[PDB]
Design a protein around this ligand. Sequence first.
Ligand SMILES: Cc1nc2sccn2c(=O)c1CCN1CCC(=C(c2ccc(F)cc2)c2ccc(F)cc2)CC1
Length: 351
Amino acid sequence: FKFPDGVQNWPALSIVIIIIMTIGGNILVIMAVSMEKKLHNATNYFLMSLAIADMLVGLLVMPLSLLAILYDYVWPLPRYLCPVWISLDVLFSTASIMHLCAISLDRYVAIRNPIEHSRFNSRTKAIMKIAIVWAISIGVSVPIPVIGLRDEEKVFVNNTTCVLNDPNFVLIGSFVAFFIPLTIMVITYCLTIYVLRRQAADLEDNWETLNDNLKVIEKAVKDALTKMRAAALDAQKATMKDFRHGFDILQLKTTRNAYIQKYLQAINNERKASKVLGIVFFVFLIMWCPFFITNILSVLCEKSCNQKLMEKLLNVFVWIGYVNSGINPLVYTLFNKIYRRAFSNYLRCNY
Ligand SMILES: Cc1nc2sccn2c(=O)c1CCN1CCC(=C(c2ccc(F)cc2)c2ccc(F)cc2)CC1
């Protein structure tokens, strides 16, 4: 570990900046979800446990990858330390996709069959769901120290570079640890975003007409006045008892701000959450695709392919996937005033 004698790529040390921003960024997420009241809920507990995995990627996987780059991918640490790092790489990377898939799956199940959650509270129900995503993650990574130490060629190429080299494990494992959870996250997300739009459009299309027909009354009628009573007529047929009669009493603009905005902001809130999750989901998908494509493209042709080129591309493609462990705290800041406000305060009033 930085002898320093023997190092062959000193400008690679500049990747430390990537490492520092991946740890500190997710630390702030851990601080925010731990301290902010308006962030204490199942979805944001998922993000904290996710930030714990992404912080441990930058804390335990990124530094030992950088060290290998510094020695031209000739493993500089003891040989037993290679399969330990490979399993820590697999564990925390799987925990990332397993968190995103669990968020999208729980959000989908929360919408289809929203039965009265009478068994446990939301805080404690989240704890079990976080336990299964870590239980699976440990389950995928725990064979690797066995396979690697029992047979060192499964984790060493050319007896020098430390990389996972078991084709059966890499193939089957890529399905269990990446392809299946990614397939679930995409379908559940889109299916969720389809249900949410159909149910919101029920009230929205009635609330949109009443609003538009109010503009013509300020243009500036007996057809536009009855245009607004028919709007609320269909709105009050779907939404608790204070809502049905709430429209039946509706100068008009004051009633809209009095009680309609209670649900109007509620639906917009659900829309803003689907926006953030989709960006987090599909940026994760996009930043891991080049590595996974190039990898699964490297075994579809055993020969007839430039294997030397594949490895060189994968050296860069793995860090495109790694940088994703730092991207999530940035995304929260851009799209949520609670994270952005807490982040600026932790950077100032604490640091
Ligand atoms: C550090 C490094 N450097 C170089 S240079 C040239 C190659 N190369 C490498 O292969 C690696 C290891 C990359 N490492 C990324 C994390 C891994 C996942 C995984 C788990 C188990 C598998 F079976 C299949 C892949 C994963 C990826 C995304 C996820 F969302 C979840 C898991 C394991 C592979």
